[PDB]
Structure 1
């Protein structure tokens, strides 16, 4: 469980302001909003790299964080995912749901291929999948997934969101930062951020009803690139003011 009550915070204008939400056990919070809105900072705060200046974060547990920038340790594919604690059944289910089995089978050494300076040189998509695999393999109470689908094509991102984030991780408490509407449509609750504050918290069906013009703007949106979706989100969110647009 994660509880946020009237939370505000600034780094070093506050980065986050008046945040209020409660996520139940085994629920999926999809977070979306404009660039610089505080999305990653929200995660940083759950991880305790950011002290709240007001309000209380009622949380305790082991957290696993997948960052939005992929990274790779020198060592094998298996090692990059497992670290040093190995369970065969867990491992298998994670590489399956993160769609790595095909990638792995294409190598002679399979998941014992060594990566790094003397390494095979992996695609951005592969590295993203391994990074997510590492985060999902870690046994944790809370999964914080910050835009993990970055360099994947539409089908692969889809199969991972469904098999991993929704199916395999069904009983975990997770927060996913995303700009994909389909992911919002599937989440238990969504949170829309802009300039530090929440402009919606609730369900996707609920958002469509309470802010029909806002929703109308974001619906073939998912067929745009990550950059264009974040640009569209940002522009629509900027309309929340007293100013005249364009």
Structure 2
């Protein structure tokens, strides 16, 4: 499916804050304040939307909007079909690595092996005596953050859906593995799946079909990467003006983005 939002505004409603947490709110609800205002986007079947912004700009909230956990108080949103969501929090259920990737869905060999390879999990499971039959306890607590995120990503990607929402999978230290995953999974394997990737890496905007930048629940820019360079030259020159920005930590990339957005409103 494709996805369209026309002039969407979404207000803080009671309970939304806890849901964001479970991944003062009552004041935000009493004062009737938007979490997202005048959002517009039009994404074709098979296209990739890259979403970035300052920290706390509404990136996750926009996903919740697509999931229907947040109501569109004004404006129009259209998409059809199953959506698959990979959250910032990487949840792990009791069971093997395989059982986690396949959770609640039926096993298919070609599909599984293909997902496992593209999410770069082979490098991980090969370190284990029982490979992907290795048993994890909930939280998969002795794994690395990147290992948990790749399992969590594989699970969401293995879901058969029309639209994939990937909230910040690529935020950890093993930064070269992340580059392979983005190339192999998001760009190749899912090349023809409609997908939305929340991200603080510039390569992802550069390879994206559409770009949405958020600041203060507002749309700072929407368009192509070419239009971002010409229509937002201050932002672009500053961020493309590092040599290896994407290999900074997620905290640094995010705070640079925040400062640059604060600067050039």
What are the equivalent positions in structure 2 for 1:69-80 lying under 5 Å apart? 69-80=89-100
Within the candidate set 77, 80, 86, 1:60 is matched to 80
The match for 2:251 is 227
In the comparison of the two structures, how many residue pairs are matched?
Answer: 240
Separation of aligned partners in 2, 1:163 and 1:89: 16
Query: 1:130 deviation in Å?
Result: 0.2
Separation of aligned partners in 2, 1:19 and 1:158: 29
Query: What secondary structure, in the 3-state scheme, does the structure 1 residue paired with 2:4 have?
Result: strand
Separation of aligned partners in 2, 1:179 and 1:108: 35
Separation of aligned partners in 2, 1:134 and 1:240: 38
Separation of aligned partners in 1, 2:10 and 2:181: 33
**Structure 1 residue 142 corresponds to structure 2 residue 166:** no
What are the equivalent positions in structure 2 for 1:1-246 lying under 5 Å apart? 1-12=2-13, 13-83=33-103, 84-116=105-137, 121-219=142-240, 220=243, 221-241=245-265
Query: 1:115 deviation in Å?
Result: 0.6
Which of structure 1's runs of 4+ aligned residues deviate more than 4 A? none
The answer to which of 142-151 and 218-227 deviates more is 218-227
Separation of aligned partners in 1, 2:174 and 2:182: 12
Contact 2:86 2:166 in 1 (8 A): yes
Query: 1:120 deviation in Å?
Result: 8.3
Query: What secondary structure, in the 3-state scheme, does the structure 2 residue paired with 1:132 have?
Result: helix
Could you state the TM-score of these two structures normalised by the residue count of structure 1?
A: 0.94
Query: What secondary structure, in the 3-state scheme, does the structure 2 residue paired with 1:85 have?
Result: coil
Computed over aligned residues only, the root mean square deviation of the Cα atoms, in angstroms, reads: 1.3
Separation of aligned partners in 2, 1:44 and 1:120: 26
Structure 2 segments unaligned to the other structure (5+ residues): 14-32
Contact 1:2 1:23 in 2 (8 A): yes
Separation of aligned partners in 2, 1:17 and 1:40: 14
Could you state the TM-score of these two structures normalised by the residue count of structure 2?
A: 0.87
Query: 1:223 deviation in Å?
Result: 2.9
Query: 1:49 deviation in Å?
Result: 0.0
Contact 2:173 2:249 in 1 (8 A): no
Separation of aligned partners in 1, 2:132 and 2:5: 40
Contact 1:114 1:120 in 2 (8 A): no
Contact 1:81 1:131 in 2 (8 A): yes
Query: 1:42 deviation in Å?
Result: 0.3
Contact 2:125 2:132 in 1 (8 A): yes
Separation of aligned partners in 2, 1:222 and 1:150: 10
Contact 1:70 1:131 in 2 (8 A): yes
Contact 1:68 1:150 in 2 (8 A): no
Contact 1:65 1:144 in 2 (8 A): yes
